[PDB]
Amino acid sequence: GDRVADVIESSIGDSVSRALTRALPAPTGQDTQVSSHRLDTGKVPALQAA
């Protein structure tokens, strides 16, 4: 019998594995979409952080 709050609300025993990622079907290579020029500030996909 559980009566104390720290045991009632406890998270001990969670046996399921939290998965951040999922598998998606990929029978062929990915397609390429049409693109055009872009001249704006604040949105930069070239710069990263390794």
């Binding site: 020029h37 872009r38 001249l39 704006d40 500030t41 604040g42 930069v44 070239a46 710069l47």
Partner: protein, 245 residues
């Protein structure tokens, strides 16, 4: 954000992390010529991706006693790549531009640059010192090419017009404390729908250091300045054989 930017057009890309927004010349984007404004009858060509790309022309050194430089458009590109080939082979021409100026230093360097665009920038001469001589600027001064040319009297801009009023033209500042790049977008400026790309120059680009460069001994003394530019919405017409000049 606002200080970070990435400009991509054609097969080229420019990234920056110390931007200061983008200036659009006279609040207008470059555009094609309409059917009610065109006057020639033949179909013009629009090569698109092969000419609308960033071209890096050359690099200049900024010193403590530099006076300034100017470049003429599209004289800088009349002999570079597919754009130069099309400009040589065709009689007519029409395009805008996107100018990016690179200049970086450390947090212990100081100085300021004024980057401005002045249309129809006719260069005057000193008229022989006294002023009784009727001289005209030589070829290397009126049309310096892609290598640029250095100002002799930056206070008058070699035309008898004060530099304190150059900010009425589309402009940006390169202050080393804040930014390290500048971008100005220029539409097509002319009184004619099409004009020659070899005889006529539309505008000139001015880079004059208003605040002198200064640093302590031991820091890096070589501070370069770089010019990058990309034509926008280019058209050509009147095809014939190529002409050198």
């Amino acid at each position: 954000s606002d200080r970070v930017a990435q400009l991509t057009i054609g097969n080229s890309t420019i990234t920056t992390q110390e931007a200061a927004n983008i200036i659009v010349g006279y609040g207008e984007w470059p555009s094609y010529c309409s059917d009610s404004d065109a006057t020639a009858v033949d179909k013009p060509t629009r090569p698109d991706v092969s000419v609308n790309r960033f071209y890096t022309l050359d690099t200049k050194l900024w010193e403590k006693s530099s006076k300034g430089w100017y470049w003429k458009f599209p004289d800088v590109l009349t002999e570079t790549g597919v754009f130069g080939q099309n400009a040589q082979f065709h009689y007519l021409y029409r395009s805008g531009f996107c100018i990016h100026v690179q200049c970086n230093a450390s947090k212990f360097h100081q100085g300021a640059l004024l980057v401005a665009v002045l249309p129809e920038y006719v260069i005057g001469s000193v008229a022989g010192g006294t002023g009784t001589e009727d001289t005209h600027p030589p070829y290397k001064q009126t049309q310096p090419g892609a290598d640029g040319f250095e100002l002799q009297h930056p206070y008058v801009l070699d035309a008898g017009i004060p530099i304190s009023q150059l900010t009425v033209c589309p402009h940006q500042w390169i202050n080393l404390r804040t930014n390290n790049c500048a971008t100005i977008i220029v539409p097509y400026i002319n009184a004619l729908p099409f004009d020659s790309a070899l005889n006529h120059c539309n505008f000139g680009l001015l880079v004059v250091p208003i605040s002198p460069l200064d640093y302590d001994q031991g820091a890096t003394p070589v501070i370069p300045i770089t010019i990058t530019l990309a034509p926008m919405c280019s058209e050509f017409a009147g095809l014939r054989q190529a002409v050198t000049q």
